[PDB]
Design a protein around this ligand. Structure first.
Ligand code: MG
Ligand code: MG
Ligand code: MG
Ligand code: MG
Ligand code: MG
Ligand code: MG
Ligand code: MG
Ligand code: MG
Ligand code: MG
Ligand code: MG
Ligand code: MG
Ligand code: MG
Lengths: 50, 156, 98, 48, 177
RNA sequence: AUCAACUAGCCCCGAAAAUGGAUGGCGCUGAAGCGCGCGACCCACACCCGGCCAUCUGGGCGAGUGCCAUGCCCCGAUGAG
RNA sequence: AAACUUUAAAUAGGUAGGAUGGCGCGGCUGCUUCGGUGAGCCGUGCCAUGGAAUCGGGUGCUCCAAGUGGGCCAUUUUUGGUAAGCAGAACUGGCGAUGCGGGAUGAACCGGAAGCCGGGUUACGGUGCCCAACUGCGCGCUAACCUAGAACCCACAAAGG
């Protein structure tokens, strides 16, 4: 009747039975959040490639 | 929040080491970073800005965006049944470049050199490390051999 | 098969020859340790520590009384040190392997 | 079966002597015992 | 025939290191049931005496010692270190047996009986032949007499092999010593 | 020939509860107790071989003598709820 | 010295161990620099014996949705409590959802997880009768005139003689 309960018992099992899903490493890694001063330049060069 | 603020449980995590208190040596500022290097996040007690949460003290990750006074690190935090690549910006005082890849990047060239040297001669080689295995036989030039016997028990 | 039998026999005799030679010369010869282990699992699959479960899935001992051939190298022998209460292992000889 | 030259002269007396001497030397060092002139308290118990 | 113990001698040394390129050499005389147990005991005594571990050590030789005259009785002494339930102690034990190898068996059996001390608790400090007229224990000393004679107070009545034995027998056996 | 102390094995004293009473029971005393061993031996739906059922995986079968092709045949593993 | 620490373990933590790598050439920038100086990108050409061991098809991507959200026991770390078959946590396993062999009897102690059969061999545990297997071969100690004593948990014994 003690409504406060807490364990991590069985939580490693639930985590690992379907693996700890690592994200697929990526060619062309994402730029979102990067330094806008760096990204404006980076975009503008690709604007003026030949 | 929810019982624990940002800098909880860090009575000893964030302290300076003994007799290394006070000033910041200039080398921690003149070591320069480039996007892709592997750096170690270790918080510094005395610099209170840009600090990373106590979770990140003692991890390693790849720089992913470098700005003035600030490095963007991208490291894996394991939550639930998945790995989240968290992206933090830490002031440069809190990061030291790692020597994890020191041996790797040395050995990469040490390998390509021998693949070149093998292309020179009979172009067969194998550039791999093997863990320390069976040691071959050898003679022992018989020396004085010390006899040791278990000691009688002196209660005192 | 002919020259395998020949060289097995030569290695077996050669070890004896060096051991007597080292003895007569005064010191002693130290045999060059076994390069290969036979590992057979001797505990059931119930109530195992999960690390142990993964180590045995890599050593390929996934059912009681399986027996696998293993190189001796530091990675493998320190992987056996972890599941040692679960395995029985040693150095097979020619009759055993054949 | 009829006592043919079954294993005959295989090695000579000087060799079969030095081999026996090396074997006995290894036996002497293999059954050699400790001095026990170290443990000044258990001398009388150990007998030396 | 078979002996439950065998007196090996094991010779070992620490691994080569840049200084002390020939580490010094240690010899020991160990009782065990076979090779692998003798070796495992050897590293025990060179890790609690000479500060060398199996990882940072190397074993060079292991011989199995045998006995000179298995046909003759030899008064044996064993000086041994053992663990009681509440401490450690030191014992001296005199036996008569044809081999030291049998004396060691008799000695483990005596420590397992007179003191409930198991094998993992017993160390044989020093073993030697304490020839007659210098023995200390009374039970050894009382067999040092020619013109000895004693009848057999205890003699199992028993059929020579398991075949000749049945459950009912007409006559009460005649026992006489 | 012996005197005293210390120590530790088993046993004993320490050791008292109400239905009749529980090393599981009878019994056991060169044990059928205690400690250490040795030869065999007995015992699980556990391991191995073999037969069969099913699931899954992987194969074969057209100028068709050609087939419930949604079939048949072969290989391998597996079987708690 | 849990709310003291110079020092400082073990186990446990992170990262790297190449084909998602490098080097040359010639181009972009509205960024950067005293500056082809850097930073990055762009096009192209070359290389790169596969870059420790072992293992092996994958949640790799997504959709729809069930039940659950009362837990309990054990070895170890551990908080309150005098303690509890108590209350609360940490790592793992078990029962719950699970039969089967052993511990006489027991949900979670020991062995071990299963289609239905024939044959062989074992694990835990045993071989005096119940009860399948030895009144086996050996060596010691105990003699209990108290119910001597006789299984991991486990069904206790203490100080002391
Ligand atoms: Mg709840
Ligand atoms: Mg919280
Ligand atoms: Mg809130
Ligand atoms: Mg809230
Ligand atoms: Mg600290
Ligand atoms: Mg502020
Ligand atoms: Mg199918
Ligand atoms: Mg200190
Ligand atoms: Mg921790
Ligand atoms: Mg690490
Ligand atoms: Mg059967
Ligand atoms: Mg019977």
């Amino acid at each position: 009747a003690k409504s406060k309960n807490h364990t991590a018992h069985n939580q490693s099992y639930k985590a690992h039975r379907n693996g700890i899903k690592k994200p697929k490493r990526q060619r062309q890694a994402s730029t979102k959040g990067m330094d806008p001063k760096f990204l404006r330049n980076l975009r503008y060069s690709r604007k003026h490639n030949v | 929040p929810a019982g624990h603020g940002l800098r909880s449980r860090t009575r000893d995590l964030f302290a300076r080491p003994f007799r290394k208190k006070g000033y910041i040596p200039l080398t921690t500022y003149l070591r320069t970073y480039k996007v892709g290097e592997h750096v170690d996040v270790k918080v510094n007690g005395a610099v209170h800005k840009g600090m990373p949460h106590k979770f990140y003290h003692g991890r390693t990750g790849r720089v992913w965006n470098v700005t003035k006074r600030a490095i963007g690190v991208e490291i894996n935090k394991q939550v639930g049944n998945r790995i989240i690549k968290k992206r933090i910006h830490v002031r440069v005082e809190h990061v030291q470049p790692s020597r994890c890849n020191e041996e790797f990047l040395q050995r990469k060239l040490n390998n390509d050199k021998l693949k070149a040297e093998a292309k020179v001669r009979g172009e067969v080689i194998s550039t791999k490390r093997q863990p320390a295995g069976p040691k071959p036989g050898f003679m022992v030039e018989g020396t004085t051999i010390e006899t040791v016997t278990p000691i009688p028990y002196d209660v005192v | 098969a002919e020259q395998y039998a020949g060289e097995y026999e030569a290695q077996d005799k050669e070890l004896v020859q060096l051991k007597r030679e080292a003895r007569m010369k005064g010191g002693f010869y130290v045999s060059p340790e076994a390069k290969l282990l036979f590992v057979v699992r001797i505990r059931g699959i119930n109530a195992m520590h999960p690390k142990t479960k993964k180590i045995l899935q890599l050593l390929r001992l996934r059912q009681i009384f399986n027996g696998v051939f293993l190189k001796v190298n530091k990675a493998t022998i320190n992987m056996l040190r972890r599941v040692e209460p679960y395995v029985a292992y040693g150095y097979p000889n020619l009759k055993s392997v054949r | 079966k009829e006592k043919i030259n079954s294993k005959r002269t295989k090695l000579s007396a000087e060799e079969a002597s030095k081999i026996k001497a090396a074997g006995k030397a290894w036996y002497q060092t293999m059954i050699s015992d400790s001095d026990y002139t170290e443990f000044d308290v258990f001398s009388k118990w150990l007998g030396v | 025939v078979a002996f439950r113990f065998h007196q090996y001698q094991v010779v070992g040394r620490a691994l080569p290191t840049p200084g002390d390129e020939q580490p010094k050499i240690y010899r020991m005389k160990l009782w065990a049931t076979n090779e692998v147990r003798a070796k495992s005991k050897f590293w025990y005594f060179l890790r609690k005496l000479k500060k060398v571990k199996k990882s940072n050590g190397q074993m060079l030789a292991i011989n199995e010692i045998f006995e000179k005259n298995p046909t003759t009785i030899k008064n044996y002494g064993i000086w041994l270190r053992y663990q009681s339930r509440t401490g450690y102690h030191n014992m001296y034990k005199e036996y008569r047996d044809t081999t030291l190898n049998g004396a060691v068996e008799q000695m483990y059996t005596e420590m397992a009986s007179r003191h409930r001390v198991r094998s993992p608790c017993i160390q044989i400090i020093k073993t030697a032949t304490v020839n007659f007229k210098l023995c200390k224990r009374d039970n050894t000393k009382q067999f040092h007499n020619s013109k000895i004679k004693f009848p057999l107070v205890y003699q199992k009545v028993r059929p020579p092999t398991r075949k000749l034995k049945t459950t009912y027998k007409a006559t009460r056996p005649n026992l006489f010593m």
